[PDB]
Swiss-Prot record:
Protein species of origin: Homo sapiens
Coiled coil: none
Role description: Involved in the retrograde transport from endosome to plasma membrane, a trafficking pathway that promotes the recycling of internalized transmembrane proteins. Following internalization, endocytosed transmembrane proteins are delivered to early endosomes and recycled to the plasma membrane instead of being degraded in lysosomes.
Organism ancestry: Eukaryota, Metazoa, Chordata, Craniata, Vertebrata
Disulphide linkage map: none
The protein's name: Sorting nexin-27
UniProt family annotation: Belongs to the sorting nexin family.
Amino acid sequence: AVPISVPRYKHVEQNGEKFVVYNVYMAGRQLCSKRYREFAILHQNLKREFANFTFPRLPGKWPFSLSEQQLDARRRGLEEYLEKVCSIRVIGESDIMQEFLSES
């Protein structure tokens, strides 16, 4: 397993919208800060590019607004997802993942 982690989530404000971002680290160094919907897009993109793999489930949506505890659970689930997919070299090194794990 590669040393990928998502040790923090944060409530942010930007362009007038309030939302949550998840801060992704590799070997203790921060790579990106991204909202859940960007992870959902990453998942779709990876599945289409790596069409012959069967990907693990991304943490899912809920029928209600998330509590703090659920934000923390979502964070943990996103970390578990990244631990799995990033530990596969062709996926971990893909242009898709390298773009995701960076700041514009």
